[PDB]
Design an enzyme around this catalytic site. Sequence first.
Site, PDB file in Angstrom:
ATOM      1  N   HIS B 146      41.789  38.918  49.511  1.00 41.71           N
ATOM      2  CA  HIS B 146      42.790  39.779  50.131  1.00 41.71           C
ATOM      3  C   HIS B 146      43.964  39.027  50.746  1.00 41.71           C
ATOM      4  CE1 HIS B 146      39.082  42.349  50.245  1.00 41.71           C
ATOM      5  NE2 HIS B 146      39.952  43.235  49.787  1.00 41.71           N
TER       6      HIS B 146
HETATM    7  S1  FES Z   1      40.034  37.937  53.039  1.00 47.93           S
HETATM    8 FE1  FES Z   1      39.234  39.760  52.115  1.00 47.93          FE
HETATM    9  S2  FES Z   1      37.307  38.775  51.754  1.00 47.93           S
HETATM   10 FE2  FES Z   1      38.125  36.931  52.624  1.00 47.93          FE
END
Ligand code: FES
Lengths: 181, 181, 423, 423, 235, 235
Positions: B146
């Site tokens: 993400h």
């Molecule tokens: S930032 Fe979404 S899982 Fe590590």
Amino acid sequence: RRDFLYHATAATGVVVTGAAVWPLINQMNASADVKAMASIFVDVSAVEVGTQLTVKWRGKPVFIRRRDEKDIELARSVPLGALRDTSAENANKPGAEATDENRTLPAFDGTNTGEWLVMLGVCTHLGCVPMGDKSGDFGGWFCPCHGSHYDSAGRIRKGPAPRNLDIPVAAFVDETTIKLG
Amino acid sequence: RRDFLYHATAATGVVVTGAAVWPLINQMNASADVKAMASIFVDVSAVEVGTQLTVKWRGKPVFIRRRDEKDIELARSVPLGALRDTSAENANKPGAEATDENRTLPAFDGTNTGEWLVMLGVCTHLGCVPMGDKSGDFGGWFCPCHGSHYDSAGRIRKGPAPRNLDIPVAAFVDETTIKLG
Amino acid sequence: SGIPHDHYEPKTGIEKWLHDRLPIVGLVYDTIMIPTPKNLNWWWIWGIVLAFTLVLQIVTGIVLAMHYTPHVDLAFASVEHIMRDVNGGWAMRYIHANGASLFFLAVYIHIFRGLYYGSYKAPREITWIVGMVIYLLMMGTAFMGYVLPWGQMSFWGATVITGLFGAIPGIGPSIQAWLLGGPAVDNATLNRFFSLHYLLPFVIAALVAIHIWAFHTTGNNNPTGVEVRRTAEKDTLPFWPYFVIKDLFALALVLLGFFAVVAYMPNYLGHPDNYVQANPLSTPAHIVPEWYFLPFYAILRAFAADVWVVILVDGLTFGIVDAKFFGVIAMFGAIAVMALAPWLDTSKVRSGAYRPKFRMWFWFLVLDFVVLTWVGAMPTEYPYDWISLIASTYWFAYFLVILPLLGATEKPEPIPASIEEDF
Amino acid sequence: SGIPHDHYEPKTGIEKWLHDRLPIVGLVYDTIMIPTPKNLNWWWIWGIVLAFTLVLQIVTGIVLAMHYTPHVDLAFASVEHIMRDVNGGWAMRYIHANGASLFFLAVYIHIFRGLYYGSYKAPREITWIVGMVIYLLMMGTAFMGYVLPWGQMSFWGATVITGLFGAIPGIGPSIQAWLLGGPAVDNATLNRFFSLHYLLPFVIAALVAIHIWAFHTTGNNNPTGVEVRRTAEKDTLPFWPYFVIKDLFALALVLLGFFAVVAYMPNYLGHPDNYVQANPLSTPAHIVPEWYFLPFYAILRAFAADVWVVILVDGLTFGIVDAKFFGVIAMFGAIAVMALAPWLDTSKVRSGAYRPKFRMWFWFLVLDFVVLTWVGAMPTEYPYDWISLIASTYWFAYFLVILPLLGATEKPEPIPASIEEDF
Amino acid sequence: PDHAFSFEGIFGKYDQAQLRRGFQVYNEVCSACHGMKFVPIRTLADDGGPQLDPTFVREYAAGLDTIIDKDSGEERDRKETDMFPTRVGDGMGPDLSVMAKARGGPEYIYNYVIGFEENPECAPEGIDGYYYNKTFQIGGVPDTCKDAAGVKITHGSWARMPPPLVDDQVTYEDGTPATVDQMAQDVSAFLMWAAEPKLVARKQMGLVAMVMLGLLSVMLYLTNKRLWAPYKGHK
Amino acid sequence: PDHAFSFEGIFGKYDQAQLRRGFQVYNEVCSACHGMKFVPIRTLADDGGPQLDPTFVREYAAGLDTIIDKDSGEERDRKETDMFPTRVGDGMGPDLSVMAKARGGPEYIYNYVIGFEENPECAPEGIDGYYYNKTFQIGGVPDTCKDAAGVKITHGSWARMPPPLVDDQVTYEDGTPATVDQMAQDVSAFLMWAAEPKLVARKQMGLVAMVMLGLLSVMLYLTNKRLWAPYKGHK
Ligand code: FES
Ligand code: HEC
Ligand code: HEC
Ligand code: HEC
Ligand code: HEC
Ligand code: HEC
Ligand code: HEC
Ligand code: FES
């Protein structure tokens, strides 16, 4: 036309349905990894002639047992009469009579037969493994699944098993080896 | 009585039903073979200090990375202000501030901290593995699931990940070993 | 008559907006307030037992499959992982394994209850057909399942009960190979069996759906040769709550005994040899497949051309019908004739509570069933061969000849009227 | 009106002895000769497509399970055994994998057809509820299934879509561990998923049972805001043979395209990284779970406190509602609101073919869906964050506020009478 | 131009001489580091690809490494039924069984093997133990070649594999110029085989099904047009 | 008499001192040939059986053979999480993990270990390499001891296992006469543990369930008697 068009649509649907169904019934067949079904070199290598020798192959056992004189004489003294299967199931030769001379085995690359006998350890009734080491009511093999008495040379006796113990195609490797396949 | 007897039968049925249902929901819990969850001795053994070292344990990776001066100075030059998680997740000590002096690691059985840092390589957002080897917009780790930017010491920055990279309980084995657990 | 009492959806606004999906209408009008006679003994419970046992097996299996690994190298190990590590383990496995036993025990009493009180007689043929279909499915299921632990009995039971299909000529070996996934047994067979074993229960549930639909449309049999007299029917109390509670009481007792077994006598119905890993190179003594297949195993291994009543020497007229094929046909027929019964009993009468000769023959039949059960385990040596032959012959004789003769000359009894039997 | 035409069982003796089990009565009277309007466009076919696709998936899966071995050390190998040795192999796998894609594509068109022609409006609430329940079940199914190959994307998709359940406070880690069988992913998770994945389709079929029962009791929507005028109904031709043949024609076309894909573009919808074995120690770039979950993935990873419209800084009033939990609630709500729709649209009107403003908003909604699909794959770097936030906001706005305002001030259209639209 | 292969399209059933050449290349070059466990040796006789002579297959199998056993630990003779060996670590690489799908695939291998040129004029010194490739994109890059925000200014990156071939590494028995490009194409096709052996069957099934379903669909369209005739004639 | 164990009944939760004694014997005698792969080393702390001290378990584990690995071939430290070793062949025997169920079970082991007396007065010479056991029934028999139709006239048969213990093979730390019979009983109980560790939980569940279901059944009987009262009162 009404009849022709309707019936033809039905026929085409049926054909497509069958062409789609067949593989769902074909996948359950033996796959290529089972297609292989090749040979095995078992070395007799002095296993104290007279007791037994079993080896795995094709998913079934292959019995290689030397001969004990008493077992031999009992064998050679069996007339074809009163013998359920007199076909000598051994596939290394033709349908010659189920005689010990033909039924024992090739002769080490030499000339003798009453000393070794390698057959497929699979009861012809439904595929169980008979118990060896002199058992049953004939001094041979006994099937515990339904009670089939085999004789010294492996010919079926005293039970539902219709035929004797088959003999796969095998030749010798010059006095210490066996080739199964 | 009508009411008492009927309601009591219903209650007993319900109780038995629940006592039967609970194990169907208990079996899915961690089994004894998963209960173990013990320690691992990783040997630093001269892996060329400064790049990285990863080892499997508990089903997750344990990052053991030496320190590069530029990485260090960037670390030690981070005031607690503007730091998302200032708790120093490391469980080998109390909730002391997320400072590099406390956040790097024990001192080899000696006295120094700005040279090694072993944390749990598991993003606190949802458990992905960030990419190491100097990545992201802060010269540390970058999570590709993400987009969470970690810093040199592992404190979370620039992303949804709420907290930094935890630090398991670990002590040294006299200058060439690490004890994880 | 046949009062459905749909409830008219007059309860309230909730029961009025439910005019979108009828569902509660179905339940109430049909599957709960189904008029059932008053004359029901304790033999009309075993259907509830079977339904509950089926649910139990399905649940426990769905749980086990979370830890069972279908493969020759990891099945035994997974079973032990279950019985040791998992929280409940032994419980699920013992409840799954033994519950199969209860399932079949319960269907046996369900079936023999039926043969007595003319439940196969018209107008209840469809129920009988569906029940035999089920019986077949569940036998095949239990067979596929006994294999999964990859013990020692698994292998050889599979071997023989697949060599059967190979006995027949022309299309025997092909079917054998297409079923085993190869010439002999191996992981492929295991995968097939696991899948299949994890799928048929749902077919059974659907078939149970039709089973329940049928005998709701057709009235429940009753101890008497009488119907509910639809034309208002002071007899025929409803199902809920009376018979529901009666059946639940009996079911509680049965589960009590079942759990006592599970907890004190769990390995009793099993074969110890199924706790040793498999060796395709060594066969144990007395394979003894199981206890719910011994009757047919015996009917199979009886005909061997070893008696003066040996019809194999006569069937050898055709060179194709050998012994093996004869036994296989005999077994398939042992079941097909039980299915054909309703068109063999040529009696315009009902429950044998008013047919004495039928009572005697029927108790002889129950004894024959028990004997066959006890004989499939004992060797084929004298005298057991004569016993098995006699028993199979009587089974076939009953179901083929005995019922017609009775239907002809079997009415020395005063039938009871007024299913309201206030005695 | 609602002519069932039970056929009176007057055909012959066969159709008269079938008074034991009604079955053919059901089929004929209800599920074949169900009066359907004439005004049906090509959007009322996708239900047949979904039923056929479900059957296809169930069949192909039952076949694969005969060769798939659930275990970390033998899953990949078994999949290759399938694609190489087995006779059909690649076909089953590609048909299983891609057919999931078609399944979801078809449900999307099935659902959006519904939102347009007021199929959620009364009196068709139960169908909508059941459909959302199904959607949930099938999403969970496809998720459990993408894991079985034990590739690389499997592992990490599972990791994150299970960390979700752990985000919530108090009961997050417990649920996570109870679902994974442990702290992290391993064979236990695989067994659970295989079992579960091999069980839910039947629940779906039953739910499809109720789905079909509902809209047979409740009339099929029709292009207009009109019913079949029950009171005799020259309109409303039957289902068989007309609409059966129409749907089968469309289905043949769809299968043609589907097999062309399977045979020329099979690995197109997939992720290549799922062809490399798993490494719990290395994560690839752009996991990109799949294409039928990107909308909700984006709605999830949008709210991060990175915009002036960031409601997370405001939700932080309560110290428990952090970002993660907020996104999870946002996703669950994105679905719950779609389910609640029929009680939000305050319009005594029907199909948007007579509601212009609704047409515009609805096409904007379709565009929003496509955009969300395209955004879940692209990083969270500017500008995509603003885009995702806008799209999620519009989704929620539509479903919460837009429909009431319309139902208030959205009747500048002449509604059509006489569902017999002979134009 | 793009040097399209034979199978790149609705036809192209894996020209087999190309695959035999790729096999000469793979067993003599790539096998030193790489493996293909997901590939049985007997497949070198199955139709579709190299329909070699079984006896040569058994010979080549017995001439490979020793895969011990699964039941009794003992170094066997490595029968064809087993799988190709596996090179795992200590200067070795991944498995090429399905590398033609984990990336348009074979073009990656071609344009990867093709391209190991010297270090560019940004970091001519390069790196010790690592070599440069113009197409691999998942390798490290020196800081001298990165832009202001970590992105690389090079087309490719630094791969741990050395150059596999020179100008004339091996001879072809059929008779053909064995330059680097032809070998790269051939080995790419061989790997695509190792990954998708059932390609031609795929295409033939697709053809058959497209045809049968077009027929069925046409017939259903006629039936529909007929049934719906008395209701769509006045308008 | 029959020397019933503790667990032989509706109670008897595996007297643990007996199991510790059986463990002292198993690791010092039977382990030389036999194994228990189906048994983790961490079960020697789980309740129900020998609730030994974990630290001693880790010590005893590290003191056993070397179980290499599953990921990286390298002889490890044989961590407790692993399973007991396996003795497979060349003068070795089967696995005793569940031998207490593959036969009333433990009584077989007791009456088997008990009984290796000299060869009887039918074949005093016996056999070379095979020894005689009173209760094993699956062994060979000389022709001198068989009857006219192959059945043996001996109680037992010839087993390939030698006598495992003498008069005072080992010492007990608790203080107890370590004759052969006590050791046999103890090791039988230990094997029964290794096979059925969850016995006591079984019994407690059975008790709880019998009780709850008897209660439910009684209440349902009362409800039935009530509901069916106005229809079974005049007769
Ligand atoms: S930032 Fe979404 S899982 Fe590590
Ligand atoms: C050792 C001397 C090698 C020989 C000879 C060949 N390969 Fe290899 N290869 C090797 C390593 C150590 C690696 C990993 C590189 C890295 O930076 O991680 C590789 C990689 C490949 C790849 C994958 C490239 C990718 O994008 O990940 C391919 C497709 C590849 N190698 C092909 C290949 C071929 C066709 C070879 C014979 C002509 C060959 N390699 C030889 C090590 C070695
Ligand atoms: C080698 C020196 C052994 C030691 C020490 C012990 N056992 Fe053993 N055992 C051994 C062999 C070779 C066999 C096979 C015997 C045969 O004829 O096949 C066995 C067998 C057993 C059995 C199984 C008996 C059966 O009915 O199959 C048991 C229950 C058994 N042994 C128990 C046992 C115990 C408790 C030991 C320690 C006190 C022990 N054995 C030591 C080889 C050896
Ligand atoms: C959801 C899966 C599932 C369902 C449904 C199921 N079982 Fe099983 N069954 C299993 C598993 C897993 C095993 C292997 C584990 C075991 O033996 O307990 C098994 C094993 C068995 C065994 C052998 C038991 C043993 O321990 O040897 C029998 C007998 C059996 N099943 C019968 C049935 C019957 C009869 C039904 C229903 C009509 C049924 N099962 C329903 C999963 C299931
Ligand atoms: C081969 C025969 C057969 C089998 C097997 C069978 N049934 Fe029945 N069942 C019957 C008959 C006959 C009746 C009597 C119907 C009647 O009286 O109208 C019946 C009746 C019933 C009834 C209602 C009355 C009663 O006897 O309880 C239930 C409930 C029932 N069955 C459930 C089941 C279930 C559940 C199964 C299997 C899981 C099953 N049955 C298997 C034949 C069978
Ligand atoms: C009877 C078993 C079964 C049923 C029913 C079934 N599948 Fe599967 N599914 C499998 C197996 C086995 C695999 C692993 C093999 C594979 O990936 O093709 C799998 C894998 C998958 C995959 C991943 C495909 C891949 O190759 O990565 C998806 C997506 C999937 N299933 C979705 C579904 C959906 C959606 C349904 C129905 C709603 C469904 N499946 C029905 C057995 C089944
Ligand atoms: C979330 C919503 C939703 C989902 C998902 C859904 N349905 Fe529907 N379905 C509907 C609605 C609304 C209708 C319209 C009913 C009406 O017009 O009376 C409908 C109608 C139908 C119809 C008849 C008319 C038509 O549109 O073809 C069929 C057949 C059907 N659905 C099958 C299915 C099947 C099979 C599935 C899944 C495997 C499915 N549906 C999934 C909501 C849904
Ligand atoms: S199986 Fe060998 S005799 Fe029945």
